[PDB]
Amino acid sequence: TTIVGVKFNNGVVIAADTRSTQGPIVADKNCAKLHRISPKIWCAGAGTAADTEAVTQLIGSNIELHSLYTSREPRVVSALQMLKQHLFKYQGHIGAYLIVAGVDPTGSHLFSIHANGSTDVGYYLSLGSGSLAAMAVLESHWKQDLTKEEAIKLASDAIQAGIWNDLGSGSNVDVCVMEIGKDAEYLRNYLTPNVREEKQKSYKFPRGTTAVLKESIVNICD
Amino acid sequence: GSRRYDSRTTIFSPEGRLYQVEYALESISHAGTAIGIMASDGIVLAAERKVTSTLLEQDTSTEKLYKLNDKIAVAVAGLTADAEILINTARIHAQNYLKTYNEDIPVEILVRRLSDIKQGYTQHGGLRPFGVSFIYAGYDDRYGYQLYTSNPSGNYTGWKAISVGANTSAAQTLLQMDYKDDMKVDDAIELALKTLSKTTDSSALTYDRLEFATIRKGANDGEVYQKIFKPQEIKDILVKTGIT
Amino acid sequence: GYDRHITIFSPEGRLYQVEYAFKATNQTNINSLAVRGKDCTVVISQKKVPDKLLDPTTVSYIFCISRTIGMVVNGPIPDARNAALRAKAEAAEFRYKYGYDMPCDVLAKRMANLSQIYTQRAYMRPLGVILTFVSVDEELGPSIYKTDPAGYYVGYKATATGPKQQEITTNLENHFKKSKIDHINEESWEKVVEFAITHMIDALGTEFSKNDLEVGVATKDKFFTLSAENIEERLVAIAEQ
Amino acid sequence: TSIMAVTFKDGVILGADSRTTTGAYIANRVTDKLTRVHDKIWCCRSGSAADTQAIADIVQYHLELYTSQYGTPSTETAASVFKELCYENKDNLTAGIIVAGYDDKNKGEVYTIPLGGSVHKLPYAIAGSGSTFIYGYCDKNFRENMSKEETVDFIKHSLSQAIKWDGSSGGVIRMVVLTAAGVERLIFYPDEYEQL
Amino acid sequence: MDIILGIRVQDSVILASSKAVTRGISVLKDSDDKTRQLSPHTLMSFAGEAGDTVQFAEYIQANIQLYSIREDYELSPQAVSSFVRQELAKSIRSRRPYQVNVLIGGYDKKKNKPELYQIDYLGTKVELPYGAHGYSGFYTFSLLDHHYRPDMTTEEGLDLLKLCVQELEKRMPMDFKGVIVKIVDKDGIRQVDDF
Amino acid sequence: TGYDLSNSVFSPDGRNFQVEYAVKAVENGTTSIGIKCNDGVVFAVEKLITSKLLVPQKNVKIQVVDRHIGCVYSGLIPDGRHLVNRGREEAASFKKLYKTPIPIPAFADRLGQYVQAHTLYNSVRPFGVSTIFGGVDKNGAHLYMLEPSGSYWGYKGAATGKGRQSAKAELEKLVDHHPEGLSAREAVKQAAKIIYLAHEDNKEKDFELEISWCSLSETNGLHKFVKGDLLQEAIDFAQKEIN
Amino acid sequence: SDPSSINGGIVVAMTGKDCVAIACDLRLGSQSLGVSNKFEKIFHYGHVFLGITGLATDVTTLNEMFRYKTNLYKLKEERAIEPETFTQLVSSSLYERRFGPYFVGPVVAGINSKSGKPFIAGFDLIGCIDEAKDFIVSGTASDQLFGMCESLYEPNLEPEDLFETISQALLNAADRDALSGWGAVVYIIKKDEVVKRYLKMRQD
Amino acid sequence: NNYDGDTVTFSPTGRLFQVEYALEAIKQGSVTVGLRSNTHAVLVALKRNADELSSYQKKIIKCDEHMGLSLAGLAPDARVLSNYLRQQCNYSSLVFNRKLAVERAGHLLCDKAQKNTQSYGGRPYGVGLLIIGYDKSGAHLLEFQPSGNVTELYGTAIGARSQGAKTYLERTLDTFIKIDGNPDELIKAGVEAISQSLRDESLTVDNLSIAIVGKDTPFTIYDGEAVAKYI
Amino acid sequence: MTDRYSFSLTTFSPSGKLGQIDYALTAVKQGVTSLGIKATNGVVIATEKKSSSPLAMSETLSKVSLLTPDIGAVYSGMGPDYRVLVDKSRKVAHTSYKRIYGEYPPTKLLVSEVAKIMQEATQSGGVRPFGVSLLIAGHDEFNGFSLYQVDPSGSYFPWKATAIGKGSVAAKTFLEKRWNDELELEDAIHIALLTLKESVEGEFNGDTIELAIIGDENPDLLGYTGIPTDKGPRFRKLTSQEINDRLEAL
Ligand SMILES: [Cl-]
Ligand SMILES: [Mg+2]
Ligand SMILES: [Mg+2]
Ligand SMILES: [Mg+2]
Ligand SMILES: [Mg+2]
């Protein structure tokens, strides 16, 4: 993974690549690394894929119950606190590295969380194997006072640096924009710069190629 | 301390009866009548709903007949909520058996465990017993078609035909009268309704105040099918035997 | 009738121990009153020190639950303090777990849920208290939420509690019928306190010295109680009026 | 980390660099290591970021609850709560924390809590990897009852040197001033402090 | 322990189990029966870690005998083998797992078919025409792949078994002191006394 | 009715009769007082001499908690000891976590909450004592009185037991006649006097006096017993004023 | 001592036009020694198909567990579990053993009975859901399967064509793996008929 | 009346009836006396038998080398409390190398007895004890009652007609208090004291039980022929 | 200390009644009227906000509660008991369903879980039954719209339409005359508002009436866009204004 987060004028944007690996093998070319915690709090995740998914869902569930209980829109610092205390309790063994962002009645927020439970605050952040490629771009092009359109561009550029230069990252760019006073917009496959070229040949087989020993109709009914 | 407020739900009367069980049975005797009849080629379960309103959702409702597994169902007489606690337990117990042995649970073994649970509430823990009586309709490859009843005491017994709930004395005399061993399912279906028709505390027996189920060998060869009748199907079988 | 000693239903579907817990609410013969300003929430309660041997400063039914939340109690002090210690703990834990200050209305709901449990579980008796929570909530603005032994709670425009509560209530209803608004349209909390004391005086038909009252004020980011001197300064302003 | 806290005439000042590191990679170059556990009781954090945050969060919670029940806690009390956590969990923690606060009775106070969870009350304290390089400098230049400006200079010069030699330390120099007047945050950027 | 074999023929399951019990450099016993009758038409042979083997076998036996008395009914070989598998599958994630491998030979009276199940200590169950645990398999599986037919008589199965034991006596490094052979068929369980 | 048979039950008037019955056991006990002074507090108690066989000075009733808090009580004596044992655990736990010795108001609520907790359930009995206690902390001197209901307040002076009304009246005097404060050595004398004046309400048996005090100046803020010369000097001051 | 490669085996799933296919080998070995040629790795609960590779004891255990859970699901919900839902149940169940996992690589295949969509998904041993439009692979020859599938596959294959493609992907992957093969089984799955074919393959 | 069902119930006058009924079992108990000088402390206990074929129940139990008690009331309850004391004396030695002060023994018994007077399900102890010991501040006599009240005395008695001995000791005070450095004289003053509580029957050899502890005497018990010397 | 009440406080009387359940239902009888009506394309649930003082802000007290995005609840009886049941009901939808299957429970099953919670307060040691009857309205993909009543005993029944509390006997009769199997949602809202006027004595407007629907999916109420399969909650509380609009054309 490469994941990033970038603040702007009136909100915050997060982005991520879409590659999943098992060693050198690409298991999933288009997996979703942007997780909804609540409608306007989204999490970009790196690390152990199951752990980022599970921890993001658990806290998301508890946040919904909390939101219902308090009759209030949930805040990012609550998701931040619940996530960090969970991860800390597990002493790093839950391999979830998260960039938490969102808007709430308090404003717009951007944090990161390390698997051991430490948290950051910043205007721009990146995590995962491709985070150095990403951070190189962010450190080169980031400025105070970004428009929404500038932050999106900066974020997806940072993810592209990871896609092209980190072997741990690839495929596509997902983005999510959380702007104050508006609905969160989830831009799944915002960029698809790695479309497979046409194959040279079709490998559709002449029917009957495969030697068969037996057949039978399987009963799926009652 | 708290001793003052304890009813002692698990003690003997001076006659050696269990107060709470007796009173649970008294509760059950006001419940909608349920009948099970066992034939050589299947089992019938028929039960009367507690006095319907015209506005109750008849089709998506289930107050009397529940599925335990694919080969076993029960008819309920008593507190519905108490019954559901026990039903989920029985459903789980069936699955544990299947998981352990890779074989569907024999009907009796499932019946015994549910009865054993009920029994526990009469001997320890200071809780009220479950105000429920079951009729178990089931099939297994050892005894074939079987009927059982269990009550709050946790005592169970097997039957060719039996009733629980209201007017069981009336119903039991009528079944005893017309039941015979070589009887087929479709005769048993007819007997069950005709018995409810005569014992009901209502003006006349209608489709909307009934639940009905059969366990036949009525699918494809040496295999068993459960049929929980839809409202429309009860309407038809009530006409087909000329009760309406 | 043992249905009158523990919290189980009587034949008419009533919980007598809950009802008797309400009657203990007035054991102390204090009346309390809460109103909302534009920027603030004020709560005043009568302070009655009968014994000459008491250290008057230690006699209070107003508690600082958190930096932002204040609570006045109508009921005997042991139950009051029991409730205050619990609410302090719950408010601190909430801040630790969820990363922001516990809102007045959520604490109210929490304490109400705790009270509800005592109405349903036999081994626990209800607390013989009524809890009025006040703050200036960061989302909702000035807030008053009140809890009773039934486990009931609701938010108020203004409220009163005690033996002479009905007098104070109608007094306040009549003001808001007239004013046409949800609150005291006043700039400073100083004048909202003055309003509160003035309408308690009218309703109760009594005069107060500086040692007959107890005042708690909630502003954005702190709740605090007034001193005898702060109150005396306030009584003087009312007099020259 | 390079961190320090120094008592002076009017109270106490906490200082820290802003570098968080995973190996030689700087995960955060603008970290805030000066953490509030109460209005005028702050701490400097060094060691495991996760450990020291989790500890500070717990301490803040404890002192918030303390306040509700018994009023403003003393700086000694705050240091004791830290110690209790650090001492009793010594096997699982990597936390070097400096506690610093301002009473009106006691004025400025500094307590340092090293790895084992012992407590040491001192006129000033230095800690973190970068501190090794300024034991010499700080011992020679510290005086008791310095003014606010002298103290700010002492910390700025000291941490400048810690940052110069310790690769783990770097970024901005953050400071927090704790007096009767209130709470003041200072920041000093590389171009100012590097060429002292 | 070491050698346990099983062959399922037309109307019976045959189990052969080595007689040696070896500790260190001493053969302590040369007549050990590595088997327990679980029910009148179900036999379990076993091999593995010392102590664990018998403790497991007898525990299973007790459970199955309990079931029989409770239901006045004999559990089918398939049902027993599943119970056994689950017990081992639990065991493998315990604090100290049962290091025991088993073959279960039974005659299903309802199907009138013999059945052989091979289960290892991990709880890996498989039904087979013939099975073995340990190093025995490395010689006998290929031998049986060749000489085995599904419709063999109990007599033919015994000769096939003689082939296996002769091969093991030739190529195995250790003296396992022959085998006790047992036949499970429609009439229950009997031991062949001269092998 | 039957509302008074079980602790924690509200009567229809909103009362806990068992707590009120516990109070009767308190009122039945020997007299004990506490006087708050300029920079400290004084405690004294009446020890009824049941028999000549009681060893004098050797059945001590005032109890120290931590190093700075004194506790005296009237009612069921073992109940008071149980309460002080708890107070000692509470003070140790406070000191352990926060280093500073427990402040008196803090300590008062610890006992308050604990005593109050014994009015919450029917499986425990309320405390059969009223407890007068206090000492010196970083904010000065504090005197408290705590009752079976869990109710407590801060006091200028306090009294409980059979001679409570005699002692109360005598306490109100000193409050009126010393509005600017009472010195510790004076309070020790007055303490002795009031116990003698309160002994009339219990004059079958004659008694042994017992006094203690915490004073910032006189005892360094620590709880000490008054014995020897200062005790006899105050016994004599009291003997003066009953004539 | 690597639990996922003691027994051996493979599973592959593929979507086509209004159909899905799921296939597996039949080998169960103990390392070098092949033990059974009849060990099927594909199970079904109603119309949802589950293939499981990895440690055989866990394969059996999980089948028994998912039969258990889908049976109770059916009794309470009064309807058969769908592939999307079963996938979630598989994930929850695996993650529940996060720090003592089942050593498996499950694969789900089926057609949603309401929407008619073909659905496949795969999981790691710890519950991560890998959803795919095209194909899922699992087992000791997963690299080989990935290479076979990635070149052989094309979208919208007809049931009889998809059969050839998936069969050829499995057969050639299995033959480059010591621990996979010894027979194969292929399920072709359409809206409401399912054909099961046993493939002829080399037995070494 | 209505308020005597359990220990957890006060009466409207503020009494604890189960505790008072426990006290009553003491009064039905056979008499025992304790008294001390500045150098020694003595227990005398009149033992009771069931009938002429029976043994005379043991009334004195040793707790440590420097401490022990006599009992009056429920004997198994004395066995429990004495066992608890044995453990507390033991704990003091093993942990602090310190002999348990008789005064502390008193406090620990008070606190153990009290817990059973405030909790549901429990019952008060139904036994009274007289505890003697020689510690670092000299000789001591303690009277335990199951209300939890423990009292230090020069002398006392408990049980059936204990009032005779208790008057005698109240008279004899200034005499026996100064029987310093004479064991057999202090014992005699105890046997004399206990005789004020006898009626129709008097002290014999398998009837009387004496125990003594002091400056250079380990707590020791005398029965049978070893007490003939005192009748 | 602690709970020494490990025995049932609900036991069978000699006539076979369960006293506390009967008495719980009596408290439900005293409760303010609430109702629900099932249309072909929606469900409505409604009740009266009987304010306790005019100084109380009755908006801050919600008698109608969202349980899941497609399930709502209303009650008659004791408010506090309802409040905690809603808390437990929301949580149990997550713990025993959503965290397992990754989707919200169908109405009947969530109802089944609430029933279970209520049944246990009828048998467990040291508790009394819940003094409320719930009406739960919801939607799910495979069963469509449904309405359920849950009683203190833990029993539940599906309804076309019904009422509970004070004026339920009268209101149920009103609903029998008006209900047909062809009602559109707006038709049922109108009938609900008519039925409710009978049992309300005082003011009758959008400030004293609480009413919610389970109808169409509300994308405007979702809070985010970009996942086309997430379409928004079907549960919607009608505003004070929305109700008053309907009360004019009444
Ligand atoms: Cl809650
Ligand atoms: Mg209660
Ligand atoms: Mg660690
Ligand atoms: Mg540097
Ligand atoms: Mg191969």
Swiss-Prot record, chain D:
UniProt keyword Nucleotide-binding present: no
Family: Belongs to the peptidase T1B family.
Cellular location(s): Cytoplasm; Nucleus
Natural source organism: Saccharomyces cerevisiae (strain ATCC 204508 / S288c) (Baker's yeast)
Pfam families for this protein: Proteasome (PF00227)
InterPro entries in alphabetical order: Ntn_hydrolases_N, Pept_T1A_subB, Proteasome_bsu_CS, Proteasome_sua/b, Proteasome_suB-type
EC number: 3.4.25.1
Gene: PRE3
GO molecular function: endopeptidase activity; threonine-type endopeptidase activity
Broad enzyme group: hydrolase
Something else known: The side chain of Thr-1 acts as a nucleophile, and the N-terminal amino group acts as a proton acceptor.
Keyword Transport part of the UniProt annotation: no
Entry protein name: Proteasome subunit beta type-1
From Swiss-Prot, chain E:
Keyword Nucleus: yes
Modified residues (Phosphoserine): 76
N-acetylmethionine: residues bearing it: 1
InterPro entries in UniProt: Ntn_hydrolases_N, Proteasome_beta2, Proteasome_bsu_CS, Proteasome_sua/b, Proteasome_suB-type
GO MF assignments: endopeptidase activator activity
Origin: domain of life: Eukaryota
GO cellular component: cytosol; endoplasmic reticulum membrane; nucleus; proteasome complex; proteasome core complex, beta-subunit complex
Alphabetic keyword roster: Acetylation, Cytoplasm, Nucleus, Phosphoprotein, Proteasome
Keyword Cell cycle carried by entry: no
Subcellular location, principal: cytoplasm
Gene Ontology BP term (one): proteasomal ubiquitin-independent protein catabolic process
Assembly behavior: The 26S proteasome consists of a 20S proteasome core and two 19S regulatory subunits. The 20S proteasome core is composed of 28 subunits that are arranged in four stacked rings, resulting in a barrel-shaped structure. The two end rings are each formed by seven alpha subunits, and the two central rings are each formed by seven beta subunits. The catalytic chamber with the active sites is on the inside of the barrel.
Stored PANTHER family: METALLOPROTEASE TLDD, PROTEASOME SUBUNIT BETA TYPE-1
Stated family: Belongs to the peptidase T1B family.
Protein known as: Proteasome subunit beta type-4
Gene encoding the protein: PRE1
Swiss-Prot record, chain G:
GO biological process, one term: proteasomal ubiquitin-independent protein catabolic process
Residue list for modification Phosphoserine: 30
Cross-link (Glycyl lysine isopeptide (Lys-Gly) (interchain with G-Cter in ubiquitin)): 69
SUPFAM superfamilies: N-terminal nucleophile aminohydrolases (Ntn hydrolases)
Keywords assigned by UniProt, alphabetized: Cytoplasm, Isopeptide bond, Nucleus, Phosphoprotein, Proteasome, Ubl conjugation
GO molecular function, one term: endopeptidase activator activity
Pfam family, one: Proteasome
Predominant place of localization: cytoplasm
GO CC field: cytosol; nucleus; proteasome complex; proteasome core complex, beta-subunit complex
Subunit organization: The 26S proteasome consists of a 20S proteasome core and two 19S regulatory subunits. The 20S proteasome core is composed of 28 subunits that are arranged in four stacked rings, resulting in a barrel-shaped structure. The two end rings are each formed by seven alpha subunits, and the two central rings are each formed by seven beta subunits. The catalytic chamber with the active sites is on the inside of the barrel.
Stated family: Belongs to the peptidase T1B family.
Listed name of the protein: Proteasome subunit beta type-3
Biological source species: Saccharomyces cerevisiae (strain ATCC 204508 / S288c) (Baker's yeast)
Gene symbol of the encoding locus: PUP3
Curated annotation (Swiss-Prot), chain H:
Top-level taxon in the UniProt lineage: Eukaryota
Subcellular location: Cytoplasm; Nucleus
Modified residues (Phosphoserine): 11
SS bonds (residue pairs): none
PROSITE patterns: PROTEASOME_ALPHA_1, PROTEASOME_ALPHA_2
Residue location of crosslink Glycyl lysine isopeptide (Lys-Gly) (interchain with G-Cter in ubiquitin): 188
Annotated GO biological process: proteasomal ubiquitin-independent protein catabolic process; proteasome-mediated ubiquitin-dependent protein catabolic process
Pfam family of the protein (one): Proteasome
GO cellular component terms, semicolon-separated: nucleus; proteasome complex; proteasome core complex, alpha-subunit complex; proteasome storage granule
Signal peptide: none
UniProt keyword terms in alphabetical order: Cytoplasm, Isopeptide bond, Nucleus, Phosphoprotein, Proteasome, Ubl conjugation
InterPro entries: Ntn_hydrolases_N, Proteasome_alpha, Proteasome_alpha-type, Proteasome_asu_N, Proteasome_sua/b
Keyword check for Ubl conjugation: yes
Description of how the protein assembles with itself and partners: The 26S proteasome consists of a 20S proteasome core and two 19S regulatory subunits. The 20S proteasome core is composed of 28 subunits that are arranged in four stacked rings, resulting in a barrel-shaped structure. The two end rings are each formed by seven alpha subunits, and the two central rings are each formed by seven beta subunits. The catalytic chamber with the active sites is on the inside of the barrel.
Note: Present with 7210 molecules/cell in log phase SD medium.
Family: Belongs to the peptidase T1A family.
PANTHER family, alphabetized: PROTEASOME SUBUNIT ALPHA/BETA
Name of the featured protein: Proteasome subunit alpha type-6
